[model samples]
Target: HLDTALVNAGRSKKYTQGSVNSVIQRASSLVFDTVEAKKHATRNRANGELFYGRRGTLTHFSLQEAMCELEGGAGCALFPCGAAAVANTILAFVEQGDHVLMTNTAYEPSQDFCTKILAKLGVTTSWFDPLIGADIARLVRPETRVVFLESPGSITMEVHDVPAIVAAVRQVAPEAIIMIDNTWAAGILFKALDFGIDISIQAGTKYLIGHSDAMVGTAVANARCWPQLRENAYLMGQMLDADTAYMTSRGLRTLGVRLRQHHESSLRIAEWLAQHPQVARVNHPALPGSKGHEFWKRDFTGSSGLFSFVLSKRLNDAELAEYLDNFSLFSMAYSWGGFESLILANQPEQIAHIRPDAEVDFSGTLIRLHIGLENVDDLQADLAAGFARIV
Candidate 1:
C-alpha cells in the first residue's frame, strides 16, 4: 500500500499539468481573470485557491497533499528547511510569557532555537529527558504551550515513549500543543498524529529529497492546528521555491524503496559494528540492549539508515583524524540521508553538553553513522579499516 502510494502520490492531471510530473510553476504573480475571480481567490486564498505565490503554487500543493496523506495529517506546511519547519511550527503556537517543554536530545538546532530564539521572544523552554515516558506529567505547567519530542534521537539513537509522553502532556496540560521532530522517521515509521501529536515535522532535505542536492522542510498538522499553523507560517514567509517543491514531490516517488534499502543496509552495518572488537556498543534502536529498544520495537515497524556506535576507547585528535580521514567509502559530513555513507564522531564528554538532561556514562567516543545505499560489505570493510587505523 505504501509503495503504491509513493509511486502515485502526486501523479494527478490537475498537478502534472499534462505531464507525468508536477510542472514547476515558477511565478511571482498569478494573474487574476476578472474582478469576481480576484475576489474569489482572495476569499479562498488559504484554501489552496492560489491567492499569492507565498501561499503555494500547484507544485507545492501537490506535495503538500502527498505529505498530508502520508503523514496522516489534515494539512501540511512547507518551509525552507527542517529547522524552519520545527521553528515556525512552534513559533505559531507560542507567544510571549508561554512555557514550552522540549526533549533535550532534539536536533541541536531545535534545542538552540528554543533556548535562544524562543527565550528572546519571552517564551521559556525547559529541557526534558527523552526517556521520560508518562512521568512527563510532572514537567507540565499550566503555562506550557508546547511539548516537543524527537524519537531515536539523531545522535544517540535513543527512541522516546511517544504515546506515553503524548498522553501525559494531554492529561496534564489539555490545551498544550504537541509536536515531534519526525524527520528521523521520514514521517512514516511513526504515526505521530494518530497518537495525538498535533504536528509532525521533517527535514524533507534528508529523506524526502532522498539525495543531498536540495533542502526543504515539512510540518503536517491535524485539522485543529492546521488553520493557525498555516496562517502563522504564511505570515512568517515560510515557503520553498516551486522548483524545490517539484523536486521534493519527485523524490517522494522513490522514498519507499530508498527507505527500505536504508533500513536493510543500516541494520546489517549496525549488527556488524556491535560485533566489532573495537566497538563498545551500537546505539541502534532496533537492536536490543540499546536505550529505548523496547519502545522502538513496540512502536516503530523498522529502523532507518542513521545510527551511532561507541568506540572501545577514545581516540586522540591525531588518531581520530587518521581513522576518519582514511575511510575509503564513508565521507565525513554534518548532514545525512543521501545516497552516500557519512560519518561523524564525538567524545562521550562532548555529548554530555548536547544532552542537557543528565550525564552520559558511555566510556568511549561516539561515532554517528549515516549508512547510505552503499554495499554492506564495502561499508563494513571501510569501517574495519577505520578501526584498524586508530590502533
Candidate 2:
C-alpha cells in the first residue's frame, strides 16, 4: 500500500495526456485575471494558492502533497536544505524569552542553531539526554516552547522513548511543541505525528532524494502547528527549486525498494563488523546488543544503511589516515542514502552533545558507514582491508 501510494502519489491525468507525473511549472511571475482576482489571490495566499515563484509552483505543490500523504501530516513545507528546514521549524515556534529543550544527540547544525543563532534572539536552549524517556518531565519549564528529539541519534545510534517523551511533555507543558528530526528514519519508518509529535523534519538530500546529486528538505506538521509553520516558511523567504523538488519526487518513487536493500545490506555488514576483534562495538540498533535495541525493536519496522562502529582501541592520526586510505569501495565523505557507499570519521561535534550511554563509551575511534547499493562481499572486503591496515 505504501509503495503504491509513493509511485502514484502526485499523478493526475486530468490535466495532461498519458503523462504520469506533474508538469514542472517554472515561472517567476503568475498572471492575474483582474485587480479583484489579484486581491482574492492575496487574501488566500497562505492556503497554498499560486501567486509567484516564491509562493511555489505546481511542481512544489506536487511534492508537498506527496510528502504530506506519505507522512500522514496536515501540511508539508520544503526548504533549500535540511538544515534550513530544522532551523525554520524552531524559528516558527519560538520567540524571545522562550526556551527550547533539544536532544543532545541532535544533528550538529541544529545544536549550533539553538546555541548560536537562537541565543542571539534571547531564546535559551537546554540540552537534554537523548535517552531521557518519560523522565524528561523534570526538565520542563514554563518558558519551554519546544521539545526536540532525534531518535536513534544521528551518530551515537541511541533511540529515544518518543511516546514517553510526548506523554511527559503533554502532561506538564501542554503548550510545548514536540519536534523530531525524522531524517534517520527517512520519515517513513517512524510515524512521529501519529505518536503525537507536532512536527517531523527530514533531509531530502538523504533517503528522500535517494541520490547524492540534489539537496532538499521537508518539514511536515500536524494540524495544530500547520498554520504557523506554513506562514513562517513564507515570511522567512523559504522556497525549494522546482527542478530539485521534481528530482526529490522522482527519487521517492523507488524509496521502498531502496530502503529495503539498505536495511538488508546494513544488517549484514553490521553483523560482520561486530564479529571483528578490532571493533569494540557496532552502533546499529538493529544489532542484538546495541544500546537501544529494545526500543528500536519496539518501535521501528526496519533500519537504514547508515550506522557507526567504534574501534576497540583508538587509532592515532597517521594510523587513522592509513586505515581510511585503504578503502577501495567506500569513499571518504559526508552524507548518505545514495547508490555509492560513503565513510567518515566522527568529529567531536557529532557526539559532543550526547550523554554517554552505558552501552557506548565514546572513548575509541568512531567510524560511520553509509552502506550503499554495492555488492556486499566487495564492501566487506574493502572494510576488511581497512581493518587489516589499521590493526
Candidate 3:
C-alpha cells in the first residue's frame, strides 16, 4: 500500500495541470487578472492559490500534500536544508526563556543550532541520553519547550523508546512539543505523528532526491502544531525553489523501491560486518545485538542503508585514509542516502567532543557507511578488500 501511495502521491490533476507530473511553476510575483480575483487570491493564498513565491506555488503544494499524507500530518513546511527544518521548527515553538531537551546523539548541526544559535536568542538546551526512555522525565523542567530526537543517532545508531519518552513528556509537560529527525526512516518507516511526536523532520536531500543533487528540508506537523509551524517558518522565509520541489515530487515516485533495496542490501551488509573479525560492533538498528535493536524492533517498520560499524583497532589518520582511499565502490563523501555507497571514519574521541556531556566510551574507531543500490555481492567484495587492508 505504501508502494502504491508513493507512485501516486502528489500527481493530482490540479497540480499536474493535466500532465503526468506537476508543472514547475517558477515565479516571484504572481499576477492577479481582476480586482475580485486579487481579493480572493489574497484571502486564499494560505490554502494554495497562485501565491507569492515565498508562500509557495503549485509545485510546492503538491510535495507538501504528499509529505503530509505520507507522514500523517495536517501540513508540511519546506526549508532550504534539514538543518533549517530542525532550527526553524524549534524556533517556532520556543520563546526567549524556554528550555529545550535534545538527544545527545542528535545530528551535530541540530545540537550546534540549539547551543550556538538558540542560545543567542536566550534559549537554553539540555542534553539527554538517547536510551533515557521515560526516565527522560528527570530532565523535563517546567520550561522544557521542545524535546528533539534522532533515532539511530545517524552515527551511533541507538534507537530511542519513542512512545515511552513521549508518554513521559505528556505526563510531565503536556504542552511541550516533541520533534524527531525522521530522515533515516525517510518519514515512512516510523510514523512520528502516530506515536505522539508533534513534528517529523527530514533532509529531503538524501533519499527524497534519490540522488546527491538537490538539498531540501521537510517538516510535517500534526494538526495541533501545523498552523504555528507554518507561520513561523514562512515568516523566517523558508522555501524550496519550484524546480527542486518538482524534482523532489518526481523522486517520491521511486522512494518506496529505493528504500526497499536500501533496506535489504544494508541488512545483508550489516550482518556480514557483524561477523567480520575486524568489526567490534555494527551500529545498525535491524541487527539483533545492536545497542537499541529491541526498541527498533518495537518501533520501526524497517531500517535504511545508513549505519556505522566500530573497528577492532583504532586506526591512525594516515592508516584510516589509506584504507578508505582504496575502496573500489565505496566513495568517501560527507553525505549519504545517495544511490552510491559512501564511507567515513571517526575516532570515539573525535565524536565525543560533539557529545560534550556524554561519553563515547568505545574501544575502537567508528566507520559509518551508507550502503547504496549497487549489487550486494560487489559491495561485499569491495568491503572485503577494504578489510584486507586493515587486517
Candidate 4:
C-alpha cells in the first residue's frame, strides 16, 4: 500500500506534456494576466496562486502534495532544512510568555534553539524525560503551549509513548500543541499525525532525498492547524529551490523499497552486534532487549538503519580515533538515510546535555551506525575487522 501511495500520489502528468516526471520551473517573477489577478496573488498567495518565487513553483507544490498525502496531513509547508522546520513550527505558535516542554532526547540543535534563541525571546523551555509518557501531564502548566517529542531520540534511541503523552496533554491542557521530529520514521514507519500530534516535522535531507544530494524539510499539519502553519511560512519567506524539490519528489518514488532494505539490513546487523563481545548494549528499538522496544513495537511500523551501540569498554581518545578511522565501508559522517553507511561516535558532552536524567551512566563510548544499501555480509565483516583492530 505504501509503495503504491509513494509512486502514484500527488502526480499530475497531464500538465507535463506527456513527460513521466514534473519539469522543474525555475522562475523568480510569476506574470499575471490581469491587475485583479495580480492583487489576488499578492494578498492571498497561500491559496495556491503563485505571484513570487519565494512562494514556491509547481515543482514545490508537487513535493508538498506527496508529503501531505503520505502523512495524511491537511497541508504541508517546505523548509530549507530540518532545523528550520522545527524552529519555525515552534515560533509559529508560541509567544513571549509561553512555556514549552521539550523532550530531553530531542535533537541537539532543537535544544540549542530553545536555550540560545527562544530564551531571549521571553519564551521558556523545560526539558522532560523522553519516557515520561502519560505522567507528562504533571509537568503541564497554564502557560504550557508546546510539547516537543523526538522518538528514538537523536543518538540515544529512546522511543516515547506518543499516544499516551498526547492523551495526557489533552486531558490536562487541551490547548497545548504537540510536535515531533519524525525524521527517523520518515513519516512512513510511524504516523505522528494519526497519533494526535499537532505538527509532524521531517528532514528530507535524509531518506526523503535518498541520494544524499539535496536538503529538504517539511512541516505537515492537520486540518485545524493548516492555516496557521501555511501563514507562518508565507510571512517568514520560507521557500525551497525548485531543483531541490524536484530531486526530493523523485526520491519519494522509491522510499518504500529503500526503507525496507534499511529496516531489514539494520535489524540483522543489530542482532549481530548484540552477540559480539565488544558491544555492551545495542540501542536499537527493534532489538528485543532495547530500552524502548515495547513502545516502538506498539507504535512504529518498522525501524530505520540509524541506531547506536555502547562498547564493552570505553576507548581512550587514540583508541576511539583508531576504531573510527579503520572502517572501510562505513565512512565517518553526521547524517544518515543515504545509500551509504556512516559511522560516528557520540560525544560525552552532547549526550550529557541532551539527556541529563538518563538512568545509565556511560563509561564506554557510544557508537552510532547508519546501515546503508551495501551488502550486509560485507558490512558485518567490515565491522568485525574494525572491532578486532580496536579490541
Global lDDT scores for all candidate models: 0.89, 0.86, 0.91, 0.87
lDDT winner between candidates 3 and 4: 3
Candidate 4, residues 70-131: lDDT per residue as tens digits?
A: 99999889999888888988888889999999998888899889988999999999878888
Point out the higher-scoring one by lDDT: 1 or 2. Answer: 1
Tens digits of lDDT, candidate 2, 318-345: 9988988878999998888898899888
Q: Which candidate's lDDT is highest?
A: 3
Ranking by TM-score: 3, 1, 4, 2
- Give each model a TM-score: 0.98, 0.96, 0.99, 0.97
Cα shift from native, residue 183, model 1 (Å):
0.6
User: Which candidate order results from sorting by lDDT in descending order?
Assistant: 3, 1, 4, 2
lDDT for model 4, please. 0.87
Clashes of 2: 0
List candidate 1 segments past 4 Å from native: none
RMSD in Å for candidate 1, one decimal? 1.0
Model 3 weakest lDDT span, ten residues long: 354-363
Candidate with the larger TM-score of 1 and 2: 1
lDDT of 1: 0.89
Candidate 3 lDDT, tens digit per residue, 51-164? Answer: 599988999999998998888999999998888888999999999999999999999999899989999999999998888999999899888999998997868889999988
